[PDB]
C-alpha cells in the first residue's frame, strides 16, 4: 500500500477558506501529486533565494504540469539572508524561465519576496509579505469549478436487469448531475452506445436526479444487461471519448510500501486499474530509460488492449494480480 505522509492545516482570508497540504520529502511530493492524495487548485512554489532553483524545484514544476496543477504562485523565501536586489531579480528570472520551460506562464506569475522565518517570529515588515502571498492566493487562483457543475459522469460498478422497469447501472456520480429524461452515452470497452435516463434511484427510492458524490442506480431505456459492463462510464453525451493509448506520469511503489522488489524493463505487462476494472496494457519507457526501480517515477506511454473512457487527469493503479504496485495519472491522451 502506498504510504501517504502529509501535514494538513487550514486558514482563512476574508473571502476564502483554504485547505493547505505540505509534505516532508521529494518522494512524498511525487506520490501525493500523482495519486491525487491532495488536490491542488493552486500550488505555492517555495524557492530559497539563497540556493536559487534546485533539482526538486524543477521536478515539482514538471510534475505539477503533468498531473494537472493549474496555477503556481512563487514565494521567494529567505530574503532576510539576501540583501541584493540584483541577486533577487536574478533568481526570480531563473524561476520564471523554469516555469515557462514547463508551460506555466512565468511572465504572469506572482512572485512574493519574503522570509517565512522572520514573519513567523512576528516581524511586521515580513508578515506583510505573507499577507501579500495570501492576496495572490485570493486573486490569482479562480474559484475552482465545483463537482456538480461539470458534465455528468458515473463509473459503472454493477449492472442489473430489473423486473419490467428496465436495465439498471450503479455507481457513484463522480461529477455533474443526471436527471430523469436526460440522454447518456455509455463509453469505454466497446463502441459508444447511447440511451436515456428513465429514472434515478437511491436507497430503494425514486429520485429526480443523482448528484456528484452520491451512490445511485440509473434506469436506462432499451439497453439490455448484456450490452453494458463494469469499467464503462455513463456520461453526458459528447463529453468524454474512449482511448487506448496515452502518456502518463507514474509512481512505482517501493519495497517498503509492499511493492515490487526488482526493476521492470520494457515488455512489462501489468494491469491498469481505471475506476472499476483491470485492463492489461503494453508500456513504452522514455528515451534512454532501460529499467524502472521500485520507488521511481517516470513518464510512461501506455497502450491498453481494450479502450477506456478517459481524459487528462484520470488516476489509475498499476497492478500485478490484483495487488497494487504503482499509481499513475493520465497526462495526455494520444488516441
Amino acid at each position: 500500500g502506498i504510504t501517504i505522509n502529509t501535514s494538513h492545516v487550514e486558514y482563512d482570508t476574508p473571502t476564502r477558506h483554504y485547505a493547505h497540504v505540505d509534505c516532508p520529502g521529494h518522494a512524498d511530493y511525487v506520490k501525493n501529486m500523482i495519486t491525487g492524495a491532495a488536490q491542488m487548485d493552486g500550488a505555492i512554489l517555495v524557492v530559497a533565494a539563497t540556493d536559487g532553483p534546485m533539482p526538486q524545484t524543477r521536478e515539482h514544476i514538471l510534475l505539477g504540469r503533468q498531473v494537472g496543477v493549474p496555477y503556481i504562485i512563487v514565494f521567494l523565501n529567505k530574503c532576510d539572508m539576501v540583501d541584493d536586489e540584483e541577486l533577487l531579480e536574478l533568481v526570480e528570472m531563473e524561476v520564471r524561465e523554469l516555469l515557462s520551460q514547463y508551460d506555466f506562464p512565468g511572465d504572469d506569475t506572482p512572485i512574493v519576496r519574503g522570509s517565512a522565518l522572520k514573519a513567523l517570529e512576528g516581524d511586521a515588515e515580513w508578515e506583510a509579505k505573507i499577507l501579500e502571498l495570501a492576496g495572490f492566493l485570493d486573486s490569482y487562483i479562480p474559484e475552482p469549478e465545483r463537482a456538480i457543475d461539470k458534465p455528468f459522469l458515473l463509473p459503472i460498478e454493477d449492472v442489473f436487469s430489473i423486473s419490467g422497469r428496465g436495465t439498471v447501472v450503479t455507481g457513484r456520480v463522480e461529477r455533474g448531475i443526471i436527471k430523469v429524461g436526460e440522454e447518456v452515452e455509455i463509453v469505454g470497452i466497446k463502441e459508444t452506445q447511447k440511451s436515456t435516463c428513465t429514472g434515478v434511484e437511491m436507497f430503494r427510492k425514486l429520485l429526480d436526479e443523482g448528484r456528484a458524490g452520491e451512490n445511485v442506480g440509473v434506469l436506462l431505456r432499451g439497453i439490455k444487461r448484456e450490452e453494458i459492463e463494469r469499467g464503462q462510464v455513463l456520461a453526458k453525451p459528447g463529453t468524454i471519448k474512449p482511448h487506448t493509448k496515452f502518456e502518463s506520469e507514474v509512481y512505482i511503489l517501493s519495497k517498503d510500501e509492499g511493492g515490487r522488489h526488482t526493476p521492470f524493463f520494457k515488455g512489462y505487462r501489468p494491469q491498469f486499474y481505471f475506476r472499476t476494472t483491470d485492463v492489461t496494457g503494453t508500456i513504452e519507457l522514455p528515451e534512454g530509460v532501460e529499467m524502472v526501480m521500485p520507488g521511481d517515477n517516470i513518464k510512461m506511454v501506455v497502450t491498453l488492449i481494450h479502450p477506456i473512457a478517459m481524459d487528462d487527469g484520470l488516476r489509475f493503479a498499476i497492478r500485478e494480480g490484483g495487488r497494487t504496485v504503482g499509481a499513475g495519472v493520465v497526462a495526455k491522451v494520444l488516441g
Partner: protein, 33 residues
C-alpha cells in the same frame, strides 16, 4: 458558505515550505482572526 480552495507548498527540501506553512497560518490568524 465560503468558497473552499485546496493549495499546498511545493519546492526543494529545506527551502522553507514547512516554515512558510506555519507562517501563513499564524499571520492570517492574527490579521483575519
Amino acid at each position: 458558505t465560503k468558497p473552499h480552495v485546496n493549495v499546498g507548498t511545493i519546492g526543494h527540501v529545506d527551502h522553507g515550505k514547512t516554515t512558510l506553512t506555519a507562517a501563513i497560518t499564524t499571520v492570517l490568524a492574527k490579521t483575519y482572526g
